[PDB]
Ligand binder design. Structure first.
Ligand code: NA
Length: 129
């Protein structure tokens, strides 16, 4: 599924991401835009052989099991395929653990590089929330 901007903002809010660990909803929408272009099916291989999955490009190195990432963990206790569902529940639940891990949203390098410090509220402008 490719979400609409305000459709994803609504789903993230429903799943309790809005101001989770102090990150306003526009931060999460901005991160999703640059990680996945709002596509739940997005996958990208990393140079280290790990893979990033779903709207928030969660990495098999630590967070999910894909069976092909040697020496990795599965700290969200999920198959990485769950992160590609049209239902964002598994991505949101796993993103809450990641953003709690100590470095906040810096875990998402595209958030640090393209969202951090910007006018992230623009990402939820005009949305009925
Ligand atoms: Na893994």
């Amino acid at each position: 599924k490719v979400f609409g901007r305000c459709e994803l903002a609504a789903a993230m809010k429903r799943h309790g991401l809005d101001n989770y660990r102090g990150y306003s909803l526009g931060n999460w929408v901005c991160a999703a835009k640059f990680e996945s272009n709002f596509n739940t099916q997005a996958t990208n291989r990393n140079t280290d052989g790990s893979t990033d999955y779903g709207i928030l490009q969660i990495n098999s190195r630590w967070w999910c099991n894909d069976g092909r990432t040697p020496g990795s963990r599965n700290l969200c206790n999920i198959p990485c395929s769950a992160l590609l569902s049209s239902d964002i529940t598994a991505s949101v639940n796993c993103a809450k653990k990641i953003v709690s891990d100590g470095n906040g949203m810096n875990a998402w390098v595209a958030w640090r590089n393209r969202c951090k410090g910007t006018d992230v509220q623009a990402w939820i402008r005009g949305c009925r929330l």
